[PDB]
Amino acid sequence: GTVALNVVFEKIPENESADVCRNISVNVLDCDTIGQAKEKIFQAFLSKNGSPYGLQLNEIGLELQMGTRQKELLDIDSSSVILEDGITKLNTIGHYEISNGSTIKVFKK
Amino acid sequence: QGTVALNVVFEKIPENESADVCRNISVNVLDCDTIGQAKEKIFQAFLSKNGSPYGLQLNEIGLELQMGTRQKELLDIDSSSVILEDGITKLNTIGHYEISNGSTIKVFKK
């Protein structure tokens, strides 16, 4: 199960130029964790621009755009599923009911 | 999340209430459900159908996917699991094993 995201990257000085492409469609799987999605998003930026975004994965966040609302997407938050033995299941894209074409903003933490 | 209908077959065991229990049940799971989650759903569905539980604990049973000729055990962690960014292992899901609607899953006493 695959979903195509409309990803918008925050403009930071850590980018190579001010000419880099910042609006990119990125496919992820419904069962990818938020961390796995962040990796694909970083990879797509690099594949498009020939230069990295510039920050570490842990220096950036993802925000889902829902109409007037902003929602941060994390591997673990207050909405996470606690499993059988008390283990917390890592949040996935599917956990957040993110649809084809949903806008995700990559922002500096 | 996508739904997967599993054709579940339960092993007849003496811990069942009677020999008349229904042991062939269609059970939905979600492709992102861990194998542990999938197991809870399978027990629940047994209970909803039969009015009695299977009789064992989740740690006392296993699931095997019937792959035409092959039989493949479904586990939360195995040698096929995905190791994530920080060294952390991602628990296996239904979708990790590429399980298709109508696949046969055998519940067996470990």
JSON list of C-alpha atoms in Angstrom, two decimals:
[
{"chain": "A", "resi": 1, "resn": "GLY", "atom": "CA", "xyz": [0.00, 0.00, 0.00]},
{"chain": "A", "resi": 2, "resn": "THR", "atom": "CA", "xyz": [1.61, 3.25, -1.33]},
{"chain": "A", "resi": 3, "resn": "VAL", "atom": "CA", "xyz": [0.81, 6.91, -0.78]},
{"chain": "A", "resi": 4, "resn": "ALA", "atom": "CA", "xyz": [2.19, 9.92, -2.73]},
{"chain": "A", "resi": 5, "resn": "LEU", "atom": "CA", "xyz": [2.95, 12.91, -0.55]},
{"chain": "A", "resi": 6, "resn": "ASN", "atom": "CA", "xyz": [3.33, 16.54, -1.65]},
{"chain": "A", "resi": 7, "resn": "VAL", "atom": "CA", "xyz": [6.39, 17.50, 0.37]},
{"chain": "A", "resi": 8, "resn": "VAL", "atom": "CA", "xyz": [7.34, 21.16, 1.03]},
{"chain": "A", "resi": 9, "resn": "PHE", "atom": "CA", "xyz": [10.78, 21.79, 2.52]},
{"chain": "A", "resi": 10, "resn": "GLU", "atom": "CA", "xyz": [11.46, 24.75, 4.80]},
{"chain": "A", "resi": 11, "resn": "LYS", "atom": "CA", "xyz": [14.01, 27.14, 3.22]},
{"chain": "A", "resi": 12, "resn": "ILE", "atom": "CA", "xyz": [17.20, 27.03, 5.33]},
{"chain": "A", "resi": 13, "resn": "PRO", "atom": "CA", "xyz": [20.75, 28.43, 4.85]},
{"chain": "A", "resi": 14, "resn": "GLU", "atom": "CA", "xyz": [22.07, 24.85, 5.25]},
{"chain": "A", "resi": 15, "resn": "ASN", "atom": "CA", "xyz": [20.82, 24.17, 1.66]},
{"chain": "A", "resi": 16, "resn": "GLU", "atom": "CA", "xyz": [23.57, 24.38, -1.07]},
{"chain": "A", "resi": 17, "resn": "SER", "atom": "CA", "xyz": [21.95, 27.24, -3.11]},
{"chain": "A", "resi": 18, "resn": "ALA", "atom": "CA", "xyz": [18.73, 29.28, -2.80]},
{"chain": "A", "resi": 19, "resn": "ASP", "atom": "CA", "xyz": [17.77, 27.77, -6.19]},
{"chain": "A", "resi": 20, "resn": "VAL", "atom": "CA", "xyz": [17.07, 24.19, -4.97]},
{"chain": "A", "resi": 21, "resn": "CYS", "atom": "CA", "xyz": [13.70, 22.54, -5.57]},
{"chain": "A", "resi": 22, "resn": "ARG", "atom": "CA", "xyz": [11.61, 22.55, -2.38]},
{"chain": "A", "resi": 23, "resn": "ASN", "atom": "CA", "xyz": [8.30, 21.08, -3.47]},
{"chain": "A", "resi": 24, "resn": "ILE", "atom": "CA", "xyz": [8.60, 17.36, -4.20]},
{"chain": "A", "resi": 25, "resn": "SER", "atom": "CA", "xyz": [6.20, 14.39, -4.49]},
{"chain": "A", "resi": 26, "resn": "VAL", "atom": "CA", "xyz": [7.43, 11.47, -2.45]},
{"chain": "A", "resi": 27, "resn": "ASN", "atom": "CA", "xyz": [5.97, 7.97, -2.30]},
{"chain": "A", "resi": 28, "resn": "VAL", "atom": "CA", "xyz": [5.89, 6.21, 1.05]},
{"chain": "A", "resi": 29, "resn": "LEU", "atom": "CA", "xyz": [4.18, 3.03, 2.26]},
{"chain": "A", "resi": 30, "resn": "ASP", "atom": "CA", "xyz": [1.20, 3.12, 4.65]},
{"chain": "A", "resi": 31, "resn": "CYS", "atom": "CA", "xyz": [3.23, 0.79, 6.87]},
{"chain": "A", "resi": 32, "resn": "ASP", "atom": "CA", "xyz": [6.43, 2.92, 6.86]},
{"chain": "A", "resi": 33, "resn": "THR", "atom": "CA", "xyz": [7.18, 4.42, 10.25]},
{"chain": "A", "resi": 34, "resn": "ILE", "atom": "CA", "xyz": [7.46, 8.18, 10.43]},
{"chain": "A", "resi": 35, "resn": "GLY", "atom": "CA", "xyz": [11.22, 7.64, 10.64]},
{"chain": "A", "resi": 36, "resn": "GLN", "atom": "CA", "xyz": [11.20, 5.48, 7.50]},
{"chain": "A", "resi": 37, "resn": "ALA", "atom": "CA", "xyz": [9.17, 8.18, 5.70]},
{"chain": "A", "resi": 38, "resn": "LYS", "atom": "CA", "xyz": [11.67, 10.88, 6.77]},
{"chain": "A", "resi": 39, "resn": "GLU", "atom": "CA", "xyz": [14.45, 8.77, 5.14]},
{"chain": "A", "resi": 40, "resn": "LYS", "atom": "CA", "xyz": [12.58, 8.52, 1.87]},
{"chain": "A", "resi": 41, "resn": "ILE", "atom": "CA", "xyz": [11.92, 12.24, 1.94]},
{"chain": "A", "resi": 42, "resn": "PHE", "atom": "CA", "xyz": [15.58, 13.04, 2.48]},
{"chain": "A", "resi": 43, "resn": "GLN", "atom": "CA", "xyz": [16.46, 10.64, -0.29]},
{"chain": "A", "resi": 44, "resn": "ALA", "atom": "CA", "xyz": [14.03, 12.28, -2.70]},
{"chain": "A", "resi": 45, "resn": "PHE", "atom": "CA", "xyz": [15.41, 15.76, -1.97]},
{"chain": "A", "resi": 46, "resn": "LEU", "atom": "CA", "xyz": [18.95, 14.52, -2.72]},
{"chain": "A", "resi": 47, "resn": "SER", "atom": "CA", "xyz": [17.87, 12.58, -5.79]},
{"chain": "A", "resi": 48, "resn": "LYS", "atom": "CA", "xyz": [16.13, 15.69, -7.19]},
{"chain": "A", "resi": 49, "resn": "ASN", "atom": "CA", "xyz": [18.61, 18.40, -6.28]},
{"chain": "A", "resi": 50, "resn": "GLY", "atom": "CA", "xyz": [21.97, 16.60, -6.29]},
{"chain": "A", "resi": 51, "resn": "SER", "atom": "CA", "xyz": [22.67, 18.05, -2.85]},
{"chain": "A", "resi": 52, "resn": "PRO", "atom": "CA", "xyz": [21.40, 17.05, 0.61]},
{"chain": "A", "resi": 53, "resn": "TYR", "atom": "CA", "xyz": [18.84, 18.92, 2.64]},
{"chain": "A", "resi": 54, "resn": "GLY", "atom": "CA", "xyz": [21.66, 19.66, 5.09]},
{"chain": "A", "resi": 55, "resn": "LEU", "atom": "CA", "xyz": [20.29, 18.83, 8.56]},
{"chain": "A", "resi": 56, "resn": "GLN", "atom": "CA", "xyz": [20.30, 15.52, 10.37]},
{"chain": "A", "resi": 57, "resn": "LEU", "atom": "CA", "xyz": [17.06, 13.53, 10.47]},
{"chain": "A", "resi": 58, "resn": "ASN", "atom": "CA", "xyz": [16.75, 14.33, 14.18]},
{"chain": "A", "resi": 59, "resn": "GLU", "atom": "CA", "xyz": [17.13, 18.09, 13.49]},
{"chain": "A", "resi": 60, "resn": "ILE", "atom": "CA", "xyz": [13.96, 18.11, 11.31]},
{"chain": "A", "resi": 61, "resn": "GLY", "atom": "CA", "xyz": [10.26, 17.49, 11.78]},
{"chain": "A", "resi": 62, "resn": "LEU", "atom": "CA", "xyz": [7.31, 16.64, 9.55]},
{"chain": "A", "resi": 63, "resn": "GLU", "atom": "CA", "xyz": [4.00, 18.49, 9.74]},
{"chain": "A", "resi": 64, "resn": "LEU", "atom": "CA", "xyz": [0.84, 17.26, 8.08]},
{"chain": "A", "resi": 65, "resn": "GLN", "atom": "CA", "xyz": [-1.34, 20.05, 6.61]},
{"chain": "A", "resi": 66, "resn": "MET", "atom": "CA", "xyz": [-5.04, 19.40, 7.37]},
{"chain": "A", "resi": 67, "resn": "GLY", "atom": "CA", "xyz": [-7.08, 22.35, 6.09]},
{"chain": "A", "resi": 68, "resn": "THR", "atom": "CA", "xyz": [-6.44, 25.27, 8.45]},
{"chain": "A", "resi": 69, "resn": "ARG", "atom": "CA", "xyz": [-4.68, 22.84, 10.93]},
{"chain": "A", "resi": 70, "resn": "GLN", "atom": "CA", "xyz": [-1.02, 21.73, 11.36]},
{"chain": "A", "resi": 71, "resn": "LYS", "atom": "CA", "xyz": [-0.22, 18.27, 12.88]},
{"chain": "A", "resi": 72, "resn": "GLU", "atom": "CA", "xyz": [3.26, 17.03, 13.79]},
{"chain": "A", "resi": 73, "resn": "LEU", "atom": "CA", "xyz": [4.13, 13.51, 12.79]},
{"chain": "A", "resi": 74, "resn": "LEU", "atom": "CA", "xyz": [6.32, 11.52, 15.09]},
{"chain": "A", "resi": 75, "resn": "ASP", "atom": "CA", "xyz": [7.38, 7.92, 15.57]},
{"chain": "A", "resi": 76, "resn": "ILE", "atom": "CA", "xyz": [6.03, 8.04, 19.18]},
{"chain": "A", "resi": 77, "resn": "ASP", "atom": "CA", "xyz": [3.41, 10.45, 20.57]},
{"chain": "A", "resi": 78, "resn": "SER", "atom": "CA", "xyz": [0.36, 10.52, 22.82]},
{"chain": "A", "resi": 79, "resn": "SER", "atom": "CA", "xyz": [-1.68, 8.79, 20.16]},
{"chain": "A", "resi": 80, "resn": "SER", "atom": "CA", "xyz": [0.63, 5.75, 19.80]},
{"chain": "A", "resi": 81, "resn": "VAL", "atom": "CA", "xyz": [-0.65, 2.16, 20.09]},
{"chain": "A", "resi": 82, "resn": "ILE", "atom": "CA", "xyz": [0.45, 0.24, 23.17]},
{"chain": "A", "resi": 83, "resn": "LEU", "atom": "CA", "xyz": [0.74, -3.39, 22.25]},
{"chain": "A", "resi": 84, "resn": "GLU", "atom": "CA", "xyz": [0.19, -6.71, 24.09]},
{"chain": "A", "resi": 85, "resn": "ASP", "atom": "CA", "xyz": [3.20, -6.64, 26.44]},
{"chain": "A", "resi": 86, "resn": "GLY", "atom": "CA", "xyz": [3.35, -2.89, 27.06]},
{"chain": "A", "resi": 87, "resn": "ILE", "atom": "CA", "xyz": [5.59, -2.26, 24.01]},
{"chain": "A", "resi": 88, "resn": "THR", "atom": "CA", "xyz": [4.71, 0.89, 22.09]},
{"chain": "A", "resi": 89, "resn": "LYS", "atom": "CA", "xyz": [4.13, 0.41, 18.38]},
{"chain": "A", "resi": 90, "resn": "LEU", "atom": "CA", "xyz": [5.94, 2.99, 16.25]},
{"chain": "A", "resi": 91, "resn": "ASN", "atom": "CA", "xyz": [3.56, 5.33, 14.43]},
{"chain": "A", "resi": 92, "resn": "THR", "atom": "CA", "xyz": [3.22, 4.76, 10.71]},
{"chain": "A", "resi": 93, "resn": "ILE", "atom": "CA", "xyz": [1.89, 6.88, 7.88]},
{"chain": "A", "resi": 94, "resn": "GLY", "atom": "CA", "xyz": [-1.24, 4.74, 7.98]},
{"chain": "A", "resi": 95, "resn": "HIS", "atom": "CA", "xyz": [-1.62, 5.47, 11.70]},
{"chain": "A", "resi": 96, "resn": "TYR", "atom": "CA", "xyz": [-2.13, 9.11, 10.77]},
{"chain": "A", "resi": 97, "resn": "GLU", "atom": "CA", "xyz": [-4.64, 8.52, 7.92]},
{"chain": "A", "resi": 98, "resn": "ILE", "atom": "CA", "xyz": [-2.64, 10.56, 5.47]},
{"chain": "A", "resi": 99, "resn": "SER", "atom": "CA", "xyz": [-3.99, 10.42, 1.93]},
{"chain": "A", "resi": 100, "resn": "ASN", "atom": "CA", "xyz": [-2.58, 10.68, -1.58]},
{"chain": "A", "resi": 101, "resn": "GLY", "atom": "CA", "xyz": [-1.61, 14.25, -2.20]},
{"chain": "A", "resi": 102, "resn": "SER", "atom": "CA", "xyz": [-1.52, 15.23, 1.44]},
{"chain": "A", "resi": 103, "resn": "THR", "atom": "CA", "xyz": [0.80, 18.12, 2.06]},
{"chain": "A", "resi": 104, "resn": "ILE", "atom": "CA", "xyz": [3.71, 17.45, 4.46]},
{"chain": "A", "resi": 105, "resn": "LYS", "atom": "CA", "xyz": [6.03, 20.23, 5.55]},
{"chain": "A", "resi": 106, "resn": "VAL", "atom": "CA", "xyz": [9.63, 19.52, 6.47]},
{"chain": "A", "resi": 107, "resn": "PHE", "atom": "CA", "xyz": [10.66, 22.01, 9.16]},
{"chain": "A", "resi": 108, "resn": "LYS", "atom": "CA", "xyz": [13.75, 22.79, 11.24]},
{"chain": "A", "resi": 109, "resn": "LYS", "atom": "CA", "xyz": [13.21, 21.79, 14.92]},
{"chain": "B", "resi": 1, "resn": "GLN", "atom": "CA", "xyz": [-4.48, 0.91, 6.19]},
{"chain": "B", "resi": 2, "resn": "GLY", "atom": "CA", "xyz": [-5.57, -1.99, 3.88]},
{"chain": "B", "resi": 3, "resn": "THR", "atom": "CA", "xyz": [-7.65, -4.95, 5.22]},
{"chain": "B", "resi": 4, "resn": "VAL", "atom": "CA", "xyz": [-6.59, -8.57, 4.57]},
{"chain": "B", "resi": 5, "resn": "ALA", "atom": "CA", "xyz": [-9.13, -11.39, 4.90]},
{"chain": "B", "resi": 6, "resn": "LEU", "atom": "CA", "xyz": [-7.34, -14.46, 6.25]},
{"chain": "B", "resi": 7, "resn": "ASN", "atom": "CA", "xyz": [-8.80, -17.95, 6.00]},
{"chain": "B", "resi": 8, "resn": "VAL", "atom": "CA", "xyz": [-7.77, -19.18, 9.41]},
{"chain": "B", "resi": 9, "resn": "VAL", "atom": "CA", "xyz": [-7.60, -22.89, 10.31]},
{"chain": "B", "resi": 10, "resn": "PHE", "atom": "CA", "xyz": [-7.33, -23.75, 14.04]},
{"chain": "B", "resi": 11, "resn": "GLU", "atom": "CA", "xyz": [-5.64, -26.95, 15.20]},
{"chain": "B", "resi": 12, "resn": "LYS", "atom": "CA", "xyz": [-8.07, -29.20, 17.11]},
{"chain": "B", "resi": 13, "resn": "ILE", "atom": "CA", "xyz": [-6.74, -29.41, 20.69]},
{"chain": "B", "resi": 14, "resn": "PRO", "atom": "CA", "xyz": [-8.17, -30.90, 23.92]},
{"chain": "B", "resi": 15, "resn": "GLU", "atom": "CA", "xyz": [-8.15, -27.42, 25.52]},
{"chain": "B", "resi": 16, "resn": "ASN", "atom": "CA", "xyz": [-11.09, -26.46, 23.21]},
{"chain": "B", "resi": 17, "resn": "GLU", "atom": "CA", "xyz": [-14.56, -26.60, 24.95]},
{"chain": "B", "resi": 18, "resn": "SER", "atom": "CA", "xyz": [-16.04, -29.27, 22.65]},
{"chain": "B", "resi": 19, "resn": "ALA", "atom": "CA", "xyz": [-15.15, -31.10, 19.40]},
{"chain": "B", "resi": 20, "resn": "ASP", "atom": "CA", "xyz": [-18.05, -29.22, 17.68]},
{"chain": "B", "resi": 21, "resn": "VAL", "atom": "CA", "xyz": [-16.29, -25.81, 17.72]},
{"chain": "B", "resi": 22, "resn": "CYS", "atom": "CA", "xyz": [-15.91, -24.03, 14.33]},
{"chain": "B", "resi": 23, "resn": "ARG", "atom": "CA", "xyz": [-12.18, -24.20, 13.44]},
{"chain": "B", "resi": 24, "resn": "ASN", "atom": "CA", "xyz": [-12.37, -22.56, 9.95]},
{"chain": "B", "resi": 25, "resn": "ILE", "atom": "CA", "xyz": [-13.00, -18.83, 10.17]},
{"chain": "B", "resi": 26, "resn": "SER", "atom": "CA", "xyz": [-12.45, -15.77, 8.01]},
{"chain": "B", "resi": 27, "resn": "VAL", "atom": "CA", "xyz": [-10.66, -13.09, 10.02]},
{"chain": "B", "resi": 28, "resn": "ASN", "atom": "CA", "xyz": [-9.79, -9.60, 8.91]},
{"chain": "B", "resi": 29, "resn": "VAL", "atom": "CA", "xyz": [-6.49, -8.03, 9.82]},
{"chain": "B", "resi": 30, "resn": "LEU", "atom": "CA", "xyz": [-4.78, -4.84, 8.63]},
{"chain": "B", "resi": 31, "resn": "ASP", "atom": "CA", "xyz": [-1.60, -4.93, 6.55]},
{"chain": "B", "resi": 32, "resn": "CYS", "atom": "CA", "xyz": [0.19, -2.83, 9.16]},
{"chain": "B", "resi": 33, "resn": "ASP", "atom": "CA", "xyz": [-0.94, -5.07, 12.09]},
{"chain": "B", "resi": 34, "resn": "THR", "atom": "CA", "xyz": [1.96, -6.77, 13.78]},
{"chain": "B", "resi": 35, "resn": "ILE", "atom": "CA", "xyz": [1.85, -10.54, 13.91]},
{"chain": "B", "resi": 36, "resn": "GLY", "atom": "CA", "xyz": [0.99, -10.11, 17.64]},
{"chain": "B", "resi": 37, "resn": "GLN", "atom": "CA", "xyz": [-1.95, -7.86, 16.78]},
{"chain": "B", "resi": 38, "resn": "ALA", "atom": "CA", "xyz": [-3.00, -10.33, 14.09]},
{"chain": "B", "resi": 39, "resn": "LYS", "atom": "CA", "xyz": [-2.98, -13.10, 16.70]},
{"chain": "B", "resi": 40, "resn": "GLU", "atom": "CA", "xyz": [-5.25, -11.09, 19.03]},
{"chain": "B", "resi": 41, "resn": "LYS", "atom": "CA", "xyz": [-7.72, -10.67, 16.23]},
{"chain": "B", "resi": 42, "resn": "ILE", "atom": "CA", "xyz": [-7.65, -14.36, 15.44]},
{"chain": "B", "resi": 43, "resn": "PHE", "atom": "CA", "xyz": [-8.39, -15.28, 19.08]},
{"chain": "B", "resi": 44, "resn": "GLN", "atom": "CA", "xyz": [-11.10, -12.70, 19.33]},
{"chain": "B", "resi": 45, "resn": "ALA", "atom": "CA", "xyz": [-12.73, -14.05, 16.16]},
{"chain": "B", "resi": 46, "resn": "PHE", "atom": "CA", "xyz": [-12.58, -17.58, 17.46]},
{"chain": "B", "resi": 47, "resn": "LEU", "atom": "CA", "xyz": [-14.36, -16.41, 20.63]},
{"chain": "B", "resi": 48, "resn": "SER", "atom": "CA", "xyz": [-17.00, -14.36, 18.80]},
{"chain": "B", "resi": 49, "resn": "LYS", "atom": "CA", "xyz": [-17.79, -17.36, 16.60]},
{"chain": "B", "resi": 50, "resn": "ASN", "atom": "CA", "xyz": [-17.63, -20.23, 19.05]},
{"chain": "B", "resi": 51, "resn": "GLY", "atom": "CA", "xyz": [-18.77, -18.55, 22.28]},
{"chain": "B", "resi": 52, "resn": "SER", "atom": "CA", "xyz": [-15.69, -20.09, 23.94]},
{"chain": "B", "resi": 53, "resn": "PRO", "atom": "CA", "xyz": [-12.01, -19.36, 23.74]},
{"chain": "B", "resi": 54, "resn": "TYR", "atom": "CA", "xyz": [-9.42, -21.33, 21.84]},
{"chain": "B", "resi": 55, "resn": "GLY", "atom": "CA", "xyz": [-7.99, -22.30, 25.22]},
{"chain": "B", "resi": 56, "resn": "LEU", "atom": "CA", "xyz": [-4.29, -21.44, 25.07]},
{"chain": "B", "resi": 57, "resn": "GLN", "atom": "CA", "xyz": [-2.35, -18.26, 25.55]},
{"chain": "B", "resi": 58, "resn": "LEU", "atom": "CA", "xyz": [-1.06, -16.20, 22.66]},
{"chain": "B", "resi": 59, "resn": "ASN", "atom": "CA", "xyz": [2.51, -17.18, 23.66]},
{"chain": "B", "resi": 60, "resn": "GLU", "atom": "CA", "xyz": [1.50, -20.88, 23.44]},
{"chain": "B", "resi": 61, "resn": "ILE", "atom": "CA", "xyz": [0.38, -20.67, 19.78]},
{"chain": "B", "resi": 62, "resn": "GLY", "atom": "CA", "xyz": [1.96, -19.97, 16.44]},
{"chain": "B", "resi": 63, "resn": "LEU", "atom": "CA", "xyz": [0.73, -18.94, 13.02]},
{"chain": "B", "resi": 64, "resn": "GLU", "atom": "CA", "xyz": [1.90, -20.64, 9.78]},
{"chain": "B", "resi": 65, "resn": "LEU", "atom": "CA", "xyz": [1.22, -19.17, 6.36]},
{"chain": "B", "resi": 66, "resn": "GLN", "atom": "CA", "xyz": [0.41, -21.90, 3.84]},
{"chain": "B", "resi": 67, "resn": "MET", "atom": "CA", "xyz": [2.44, -21.05, 0.68]},
{"chain": "B", "resi": 68, "resn": "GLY", "atom": "CA", "xyz": [1.10, -23.63, -1.80]},
{"chain": "B", "resi": 69, "resn": "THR", "atom": "CA", "xyz": [3.60, -26.41, -0.99]},
{"chain": "B", "resi": 70, "resn": "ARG", "atom": "CA", "xyz": [5.57, -24.36, 1.62]},
{"chain": "B", "resi": 71, "resn": "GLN", "atom": "CA", "xyz": [4.64, -23.70, 5.28]},
{"chain": "B", "resi": 72, "resn": "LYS", "atom": "CA", "xyz": [6.12, -20.42, 6.68]},
{"chain": "B", "resi": 73, "resn": "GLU", "atom": "CA", "xyz": [5.95, -19.42, 10.39]},
{"chain": "B", "resi": 74, "resn": "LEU", "atom": "CA", "xyz": [4.82, -15.83, 11.02]},
{"chain": "B", "resi": 75, "resn": "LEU", "atom": "CA", "xyz": [6.68, -14.12, 13.83]},
{"chain": "B", "resi": 76, "resn": "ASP", "atom": "CA", "xyz": [6.95, -10.64, 15.39]},
{"chain": "B", "resi": 77, "resn": "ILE", "atom": "CA", "xyz": [10.78, -10.76, 15.17]},
{"chain": "B", "resi": 78, "resn": "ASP", "atom": "CA", "xyz": [12.78, -13.08, 12.87]},
{"chain": "B", "resi": 79, "resn": "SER", "atom": "CA", "xyz": [15.81, -13.10, 10.62]},
{"chain": "B", "resi": 80, "resn": "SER", "atom": "CA", "xyz": [13.78, -11.21, 8.00]},
{"chain": "B", "resi": 81, "resn": "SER", "atom": "CA", "xyz": [12.93, -8.24, 10.24]},
{"chain": "B", "resi": 82, "resn": "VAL", "atom": "CA", "xyz": [13.74, -4.65, 9.31]},
{"chain": "B", "resi": 83, "resn": "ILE", "atom": "CA", "xyz": [16.41, -2.88, 11.42]},
{"chain": "B", "resi": 84, "resn": "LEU", "atom": "CA", "xyz": [15.58, 0.78, 11.55]},
{"chain": "B", "resi": 85, "resn": "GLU", "atom": "CA", "xyz": [17.81, 3.91, 11.74]},
{"chain": "B", "resi": 86, "resn": "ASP", "atom": "CA", "xyz": [18.97, 3.65, 15.36]},
{"chain": "B", "resi": 87, "resn": "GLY", "atom": "CA", "xyz": [19.55, -0.12, 15.37]},
{"chain": "B", "resi": 88, "resn": "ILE", "atom": "CA", "xyz": [15.98, -0.66, 16.59]},
{"chain": "B", "resi": 89, "resn": "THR", "atom": "CA", "xyz": [14.15, -3.66, 14.99]},
{"chain": "B", "resi": 90, "resn": "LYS", "atom": "CA", "xyz": [10.72, -3.02, 13.45]},
{"chain": "B", "resi": 91, "resn": "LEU", "atom": "CA", "xyz": [8.16, -5.65, 14.45]},
{"chain": "B", "resi": 92, "resn": "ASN", "atom": "CA", "xyz": [6.97, -7.79, 11.50]},
{"chain": "B", "resi": 93, "resn": "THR", "atom": "CA", "xyz": [3.54, -6.91, 10.15]},
{"chain": "B", "resi": 94, "resn": "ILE", "atom": "CA", "xyz": [1.13, -8.74, 7.92]},
{"chain": "B", "resi": 95, "resn": "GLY", "atom": "CA", "xyz": [2.33, -6.60, 4.99]},
{"chain": "B", "resi": 96, "resn": "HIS", "atom": "CA", "xyz": [5.97, -7.52, 5.76]},
{"chain": "B", "resi": 97, "resn": "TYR", "atom": "CA", "xyz": [5.18, -11.09, 4.76]},
{"chain": "B", "resi": 98, "resn": "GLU", "atom": "CA", "xyz": [3.26, -10.05, 1.62]},
{"chain": "B", "resi": 99, "resn": "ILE", "atom": "CA", "xyz": [0.14, -11.95, 2.73]},
{"chain": "B", "resi": 100, "resn": "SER", "atom": "CA", "xyz": [-2.69, -11.82, 0.19]},
{"chain": "B", "resi": 101, "resn": "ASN", "atom": "CA", "xyz": [-6.49, -11.81, 0.75]},
{"chain": "B", "resi": 102, "resn": "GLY", "atom": "CA", "xyz": [-7.62, -15.39, 1.23]},
{"chain": "B", "resi": 103, "resn": "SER", "atom": "CA", "xyz": [-4.24, -16.74, 2.32]},
{"chain": "B", "resi": 104, "resn": "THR", "atom": "CA", "xyz": [-4.47, -19.79, 4.60]},
{"chain": "B", "resi": 105, "resn": "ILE", "atom": "CA", "xyz": [-3.12, -19.29, 8.10]},
{"chain": "B", "resi": 106, "resn": "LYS", "atom": "CA", "xyz": [-2.77, -22.32, 10.39]},
{"chain": "B", "resi": 107, "resn": "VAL", "atom": "CA", "xyz": [-3.01, -21.70, 14.16]},
{"chain": "B", "resi": 108, "resn": "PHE", "atom": "CA", "xyz": [-0.97, -24.43, 15.83]},
{"chain": "B", "resi": 109, "resn": "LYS", "atom": "CA", "xyz": [0.03, -25.30, 19.39]},
{"chain": "B", "resi": 110, "resn": "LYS", "atom": "CA", "xyz": [3.73, -24.37, 19.88]}
]
